[PDB]
RNA sequence: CCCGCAGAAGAAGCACCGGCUAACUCCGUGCCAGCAGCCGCGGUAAUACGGAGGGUGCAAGCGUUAAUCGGAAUUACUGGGC
RNA sequence: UCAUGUUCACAUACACAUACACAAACGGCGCGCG
């Protein structure tokens, strides 16, 4: 995004919810044998976004044709994994 | 009227996991899932087009436990209902009562859900339904009766349903052993891999 | 030691540092005052974005150099977007603004 | 699963493997340069 | 039509012999027998070392094996142990003191016998013969051979009728006696019989005629 | 063709005849083998296939083929016949039903027993 | 990006002094999936080289078809050597309910709703050329209103 | 990130959020199970004293640690000063096409 | 129709596997015996005959034959040609 | 001028090489160089 000034302020609770894509619930990150992110933990692919480059976690979709579908095996959105750092 | 053979066999034949076992134990540990069934399994002869249509049909039918006559009847009902034939077919199949039971988790596998619905543990709006293929309509309060509400397997399946990711169009309270059907599932609310068009054109050959 | 291109760090996409890793030299704080003390603005813009941090611009730059076009598209560094989120991860709403 | 050391490395031909012995370790007295495989480890799956 | 063995017809002109010694009619046959036995046992031992070419040379007091292969590491191991053991075994076979010298070939893709062993191994592990041949041709050409021509023959892919398939990439002139044509042949012993493999590799027309 | 000509003499679809007239649109008919014999096929095949000149109930006399490996029939025998041509016995447009009045059961058939009228062995 | 699929791989022959020289011909169709399609017909001694030559020829000489939202603009008939084709626009959700090669071409062109039929011969080559003809000679409201000199709302 | 074999790098913040979320899970429990004032004042103190860690560890009475008294780096320790973004990665940064 | 009774206890076949057509290997046999909806298979290594194992498809049925329509723009009014 | 030739009988969609794309990271503690 192009810009030409910067502003800072306190974030009201509804603004903070607005930045959210999900609400974290479990005190966990990734499994300790396999290494999938444990869902609703601090890495859950459906809160933040998919781990694999442009393909989903539940395995159901693996091609740009499905770009932006949300599955119903685990609930992840298939999208750019780049956005996993954005949300 | 039912498939009584090995289940992981079907899973291997399809290739995918069809969820025919509870998923306590990994399928790789129970079998060589990466291999077609039988002596001559290890081979992928370039599948014919109708062949892949057939394979998709078999995948869905053996995920849900529906014999082909009933499945063709479902196909015809979908052709009747207006809208998109594929989403309509998925709507009917999901609306199957044994499927709703498995969904609300009162059964480790859809086989167990059919078993309990057959042995009269399932009641829709206080009326005990004995046919597994009953068509649950929207906003139906489907409950479990007491006699099999003591069932240890029932409670363990409640826990394993809490393990699974929960469907969005079903409101099931485990303590009260009571689910409620609210809205017909969306295509996006079902698994995504299944392609409507394959089954559609297969039966509209 | 010398580096054309290679690794980048994960948290922010700036290059790794080392010989034991194929690293890029730090154009550290004092060097930036040194450029600012010449008039040199475009050199600096490059040095701390296109050559460094802008995840788009560096791949567009590379291709423009192999094409020999000698032109850059400078964008905005992703380490600065890291900062915004690390502030916005406090209850401090910092945001970019338009006019 | 468990790793192996081998010459049977996938995706590489004798052009590189010529300096390994048959076990999967370089010969003593091999003279080596960047990118030579010294030890042909492999991982399952 | 039936072809002339290229290395054979080029002997003396371009290529050098494998064996090199002089011995009169009393010694000759026994020399040849010992050499045949040592080559037999040597190949059988170093089936995996990628042994391109042996060279026997007995200067009337000993035998000198000079073995061009691509895996000195594999044939030697730690500090020539396999080397010296093979040497003593060769000495017992031949009946004279022995000596081994190992030469390392740089491009395993350009030696005919090496390519032959590779294609034969692929076929024994039941890969698609067409794909094997194509990949071999690509490897040789990309390495930079001025020409290469490969041919597999017999029961290709388990068919009942045998036939000969072959590829040529680039130029491989045979009638030019001053062209360095490497040639070799091999046999893949599959469950349907032997599948033959021939490989010509034209490396350049060397005009002086060294050795 | 002009609409006018079609008016004067309409189009009367081609009539596809019966491929099995002696059955008279009836799935099977009874017969009484007048003569059981063997005939050689037509090129390129070679065999000695078993056929019976058979007298239908309605009076037609056809040549029926005797399927399966081995038969125990003879003349004066009551058989049941169904449709379908052999092909390599040109002029034979009927099969005999196996496991019928006199057309006995085959021996030691373990596949297609329903095709060949053989009992379900000890199972 | 161009979604491409073959249709038919036939083995043709040429008799020469010794015996018969076999050769394969693969007829493939490519298309971007948004409305630009193109077919190619390659021949070589081997199936892979044949298919690859076909696909090169097809990736060149593609055409535009005036598309309306995954269906055609008006019932169109096309004729080539032996095949005759009837392609009718269809409602939403119908599917690509058509023959084999017709399905291939319409699908890579992107059309998801179309009623088709292949009267006369069914030779995949002629049927594909006839399908491409029938897709080309289809004009959209923009085209026809430009051609008569009116608005898109006057012709509708 | 995983390191040398099957071990995750101790990635500090994920230990701080882990503190928070554990405390919050307990506090939702003990609220809905309706604990008495003294118990909830315990967990509510421990939660406020944990979010304290996550924001600016060590402005508390003591910085919290997970090793031989190494204080875990919290968010505000990532922003500020000589190892934090403003000096370490924004104002001057490593660059490609360089050598020494 | 409801309630209670003990017991997995009382309940699975049929066709097909050369291509069209989903799904293969071994053995028996040797243009014989045989199969076959069409093309074809069988003459000493039968993925096509017979048996086995394996698999595929339908399932209280499955297959075979008979019959009509469609496919057949193959009586072409819609919609053929000389 | 110059006839005839027993029967049957002859390789087919590229579903990859130890699906495409994918090359080492973060903090102390030290020593040393400037
Ligand atoms: Mg007739
Ligand atoms: Mg098949
Ligand atoms: Mg049969
Ligand atoms: Mg046999
Ligand atoms: Mg057959
Ligand atoms: Mg058989
Ligand atoms: Mg029934
Ligand atoms: Mg008609
Ligand atoms: Mg006509
Ligand atoms: Mg005569
Ligand atoms: Mg003749
Ligand atoms: Zn998914």
UniProtKB/Swiss-Prot annotation, chain B:
The keyword rRNA-binding applies. Belongs to the universal ribosomal protein uS4 family. Residues 95-155 form the S4 RNA-binding domain. The keyword Ion transport does not apply. Part of the 30S ribosomal subunit. Contacts protein S5. With proteins S3 and S5 encircles the mRNA as it enters the ribosome, which may play a role in mRNA helicase processivity. Some nascent polypeptide chains are able to cross-link to this protein in situ. The rRNA transcription and antitermination complex (rrnTAC) consists of RNAP, NusA, NusB, NusE (rpsJ), NusG, SubB, ribosomal protein S4, DNA and precursor rRNA; S4 is more flexible than other subunits. This is Small ribosomal subunit protein uS4. GO terms for molecular function: mRNA 5'-UTR binding; mRNA regulatory element binding translation repressor activity; rRNA binding; structural constituent of ribosome. NCBIfam families: PRK05327.1, rpsD_bact. It comes from the Bacteria. GO terms for biological process: cytoplasmic translation; DNA-templated transcription termination; maintenance of translational fidelity; negative regulation of translational initiation; response to antibiotic; ribosomal small subunit assembly; ribosomal small subunit biogenesis; transcription antitermination. InterPro entries: Ribosomal_uS4, Ribosomal_uS4_bac-type, Ribosomal_uS4_CS, Ribosomal_uS4_N, S4_RNA-bd, S4_RNA-bd_sf. One of two assembly initiator proteins for the 30S subunit, it binds directly to 16S rRNA where it nucleates assembly of the body of the 30S subunit.
From Swiss-Prot, chain C:
It comes from the Bacteria. Co-administration of salinamide and rifampicin or salinamide and myxopyronin suppresses the emergence of resistance to both antibiotics. Acetylated on several lysine residues in the presence of glucose. DNA-dependent RNA polymerase (RNAP) catalyzes the transcription of DNA into RNA using the four ribonucleoside triphosphates as substrates. The RNAP catalytic core consists of 2 alpha, 1 beta, 1 beta' and 1 omega subunit. When a sigma factor is associated with the core the holoenzyme is formed, which can initiate transcription. The rRNA transcription and antitermination complex (rrnTAC) consists of RNAP, NusA, NusB, NusE (rpsJ), NusG, SubB, ribosomal protein S4, DNA and precursor rRNA; S4 is more flexible than other subunits. In pull-down experiments interacts with CedA. (Microbial infection) Interacts (via flap domain) with Escherichia phage lambda antitermination protein Q; this interaction renders bacterial RNAP resistant to transcription pausing and allows it to read through termination signals. Belongs to the RNA polymerase beta chain family. This is DNA-directed RNA polymerase subunit beta. It comes from Escherichia coli (strain K12). The lineage of its organism: Bacteria, Pseudomonadati, Pseudomonadota, Gammaproteobacteria, Enterobacterales. The gene is rpoB. The chain holds residues 1244 to 1342 of 1342 of the full protein.
Curated annotation (Swiss-Prot), chain E:
The gene is rpsC. This is Small ribosomal subunit protein uS3. PANTHER family: 30S/40S RIBOSOMAL PROTEIN S3, SMALL RIBOSOMAL SUBUNIT PROTEIN US3C. It holds the Pfam family KH_2. GO terms for biological process: cytoplasmic translation; ribosomal small subunit assembly. The keyword Ribonucleoprotein applies. Keywords: Ribonucleoprotein, Ribosomal protein, RNA-binding, rRNA-binding. HAMAP family: Ribosomal_uS3_B (MF_01309_B). Gene3D superfamilies: 3.30.300.20, Ribosomal protein S3, C-terminal domain. Binds the lower part of the 30S subunit head. Binds mRNA in the 70S ribosome, positioning it for translation. Plays a role in mRNA unwinding by the ribosome, possibly by forming part of a processivity clamp. GO terms for cellular component: cytoplasm; cytosol; cytosolic small ribosomal subunit. GO terms for molecular function: mRNA binding; rRNA binding; structural constituent of ribosome. It comes from the Bacteria. Residues 38-106 form the KH type-2 domain. Part of the 30S ribosomal subunit. Forms a tight complex with proteins uS10 and uS14. With proteins uS4 and uS5 encircles the mRNA as it enters the ribosome, which may play a role in mRNA helicase processivity. Some nascent polypeptide chains are able to cross-link to this protein in situ. In collided ribosomes contacts ribosome rescue factor SmrB.
From Swiss-Prot, chain G:
It comes from Escherichia coli (strain K12). The N-terminal domain interacts with the head of the 30S subunit; the C-terminal domain interacts with the body and contacts protein uS4. The interaction surface between uS4 and uS5 is involved in control of translational fidelity. Residues 2-65 form the S5 DRBM domain. Keywords: Acetylation, Antibiotic resistance, Ribonucleoprotein, Ribosomal protein, RNA-binding, rRNA-binding. This is Small ribosomal subunit protein uS5. One of its GO terms (cellular component) is cytosolic small ribosomal subunit. NCBIfam families: rpsE_bact. Part of the 30S ribosomal subunit. Contacts proteins uS4 and uS8. With proteins uS4 and uS5 encircles the mRNA as it enters the ribosome, which may play a role in mRNA helicase processivity. Can be cross-linked to mRNA. In collided ribosomes contacts ribosome rescue factor SmrB. The keyword Transcription does not apply. Gene3D superfamilies: 3.30.160.20, 3.30.230.10. The gene is rpsE.
């Amino acid at each position: 995004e192009e810009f030409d000034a910067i502003k800072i302020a306190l974030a009201s609770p509804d603004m903070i919810r607005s930045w959210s894509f999900g609400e974290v619930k479990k005190p966990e990150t990734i499994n300790y044998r396999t290494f999938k992110p444990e869902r609703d933990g601090l890495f859950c692919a459906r809160i933040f976004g998919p781990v694999k480059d442009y393909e989903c976690l539940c395995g159901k979709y693996k091609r740009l044709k499905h770009r932006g579908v949300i599955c119903e095996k685990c609930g992840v959105e298939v999208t750019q994994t780049k956005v996993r750092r954005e949300r | 009227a039912r498939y009584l053979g090995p289940k992981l066999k079907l899973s291997r034949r399809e290739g995918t996991d069809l969820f025919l076992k509870s998923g306590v134990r990994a399928i790789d540990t129970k079998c060589k899932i990466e291999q077609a069934p039988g002596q001559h399994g290890a081979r992928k002869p370039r599948l014919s087009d109708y062949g892949v249509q057939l394979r998709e049909k078999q995948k869905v039918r053996r995920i849900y436990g529906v014999l082909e006559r009933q499945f063709r009847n479902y196909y015809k009902e979908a052709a009747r209902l207006k809208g998109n034939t594929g989403e309509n077919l998925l709507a009917l199949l999901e609306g199957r009562l044994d499927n709703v039971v498995y969904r609300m988790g009162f059964g480790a596998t859809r086989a167990e859900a059919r078993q309990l619905v057959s042995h009269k543990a399932i009641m829709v709006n206080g009326r005990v339904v004995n046919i597994a293929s009953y068509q649950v309509s929207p906003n139906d309060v489907v409950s479990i009766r007491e006699k099999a509400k003591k069932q240890s397997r029932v409670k363990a399946a409640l826990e394993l349903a809490e393990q699974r990711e929960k469907p969005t169009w079903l409101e099931v309270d485990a303590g009260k052993m009571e689910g409620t059907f609210k809205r017909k599932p969306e295509r996006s609310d079902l698994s995504a891999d299944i392609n409507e068009h394959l089954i559609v054109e297969l039966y509209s050959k | 030691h010398a580096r054309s291109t290679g690794s980048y760090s994960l948290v922010t996409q700036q290059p790794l540092g080392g010989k034991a890793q194929f690293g890029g030299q730090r154009f550290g704080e004092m060097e930036v005052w040194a450029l600012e003390a010449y008039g040199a603005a475009y050199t600096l813009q490059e040095m701390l974005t296109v050559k460094s941090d802008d995840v788009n611009g560096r791949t567009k730059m590379y291709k423009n150099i192999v094409d020999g076009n000698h032109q850059m598209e400078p964008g905005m560094p992703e380490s600065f977007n890291v900062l915004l989120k690390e502030i916005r991860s406090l209850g401090i709403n910092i945001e970019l603004e338009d006019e | 699963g468990p790793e192996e050391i081998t010459a049977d490395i996938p995706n590489v031909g004798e052009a590189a493997l010529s300096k390994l012995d048959e076990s999967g370790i370089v010969y003593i007295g091999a003279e080596v340069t960047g990118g030579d495989i010294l030890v042909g480890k492999v991982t399952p799956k | 039509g039936q072809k002339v063995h290229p290395n054979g017809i080029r002997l003396g002109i371009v290529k050098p012999w494998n064996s090199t010694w002089f011995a009169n009619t009393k010694e000759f046959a026994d020399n040849l027998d010992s050499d045949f036995k040592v080559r037999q046992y040597l190949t059988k031992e170093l089936a995996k070392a990628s042994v391109s070419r042996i060279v026997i040379e007995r200067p009337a007091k000993s035998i000198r094996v000079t073995i061009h292969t691509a895996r000195p590491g594999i044939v030697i191991g730690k500090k020539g142990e396999d080397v010296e053991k093979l040497r003593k075994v060769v000495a017992d076979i031949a009946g004279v003191p022995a000596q081994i010298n190992i030469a390392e070939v740089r491009k395993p893709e350009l030696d005919a016998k090496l390519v032959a062993d590779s294609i034969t191994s692929q076929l024994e592990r039941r890969v698609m013969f067409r794909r094997a041949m194509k990949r071999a041709v690509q490897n040789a050409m990309r390495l930079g051979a001025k020409g290469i021509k490969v041919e597999v023959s017999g029961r290709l892919g388990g068919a009942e009728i045998a036939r000969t398939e072959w590829y040529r990439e680039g130029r491989v002139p045979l009638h030019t006696l001053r062209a360095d044509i490497d040639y070799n042949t091999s046999e893949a012993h599959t469950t349907y019989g032997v599948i033959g493999v021939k490989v010509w590799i034209f490396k350049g027309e060397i005009l002086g005629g060294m050795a | 063709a002009t609409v006018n000509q079609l008016v004067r003499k309409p189009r009367a679809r081609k009539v596809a005849k019966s491929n099995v007239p002696a059955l008279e649109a009836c799935p099977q008919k009874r017969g009484v083998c007048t003569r059981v014999y063997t005939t050689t096929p037509k090129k390129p095949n070679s065999a000695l296939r078993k056929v019976c000149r058979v007298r239908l109930t309605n009076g037609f006399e056809v040549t029926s083929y005797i399927g399966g490996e081995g038969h125990n029939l003879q003349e004066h025998s009551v058989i049941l016949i169904r449709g379908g041509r052999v092909k390599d016995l040109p002029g034979v447009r009927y099969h005999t039903v196996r496991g019928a009045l006199d057309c006995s059961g085959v021996k030691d058939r373990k596949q297609a027993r329903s095709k060949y009228g053989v009992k379900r062995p000890k199972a | 990006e161009l979604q491409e699929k073959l249709i038919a791989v036939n083995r043709v022959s040429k008799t020469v002094k010794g015996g018969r020289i076999f050769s394969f011909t693969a007829l493939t169709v490519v298309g971007d999936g948004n409305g630009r399609v193109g077919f190619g017909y390659g021949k070589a001694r081997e199936v892979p080289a044949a298919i690859q030559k076909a696909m090169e020829k097809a990736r060149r000489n593609m055409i535009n078809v005036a598309l309306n939202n995954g269906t055609l603009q008006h019932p169109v008939k096309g004729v080539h050597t032996g095949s005759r084709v009837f392609m009718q626009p269809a409602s939403e959700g119908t599917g690509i309910i058509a023959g084999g090669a017709m399905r291939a071409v319409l699908e890579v062109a992107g059309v998801h709703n179309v009623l088709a039929k292949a009267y006369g011969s069914t030779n995949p080559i002629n049927v594909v050329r006839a399908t491409i003809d029938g897709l080309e000679n289809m004009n959209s409201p923009a085209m026809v209103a430009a051609k008569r000199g009116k608005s898109v709302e006057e012709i509708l | 990130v995983p390191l040398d074999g099957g071990r995750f790098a101790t990635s500090d913040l994920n230990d701080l959020y882990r503190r928070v979320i554990n405390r919050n899970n307990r506090l939702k429990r003990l609220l809905d199970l309706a604990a008495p004032d003294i118990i909830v004042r315990n967990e509510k103190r421990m939660l406020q004293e944990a979010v304290d860690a996550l924001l600016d560890n060590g402005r508390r009475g003591r910085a919290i640690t997970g090793s031989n008294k190494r204080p875990l780096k919290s968010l505000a320790d990532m922003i500020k000063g000589k190892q934090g973004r403003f000096r370490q990665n924004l104002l001057g940064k490593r660059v490609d096409y360089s050598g020494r």
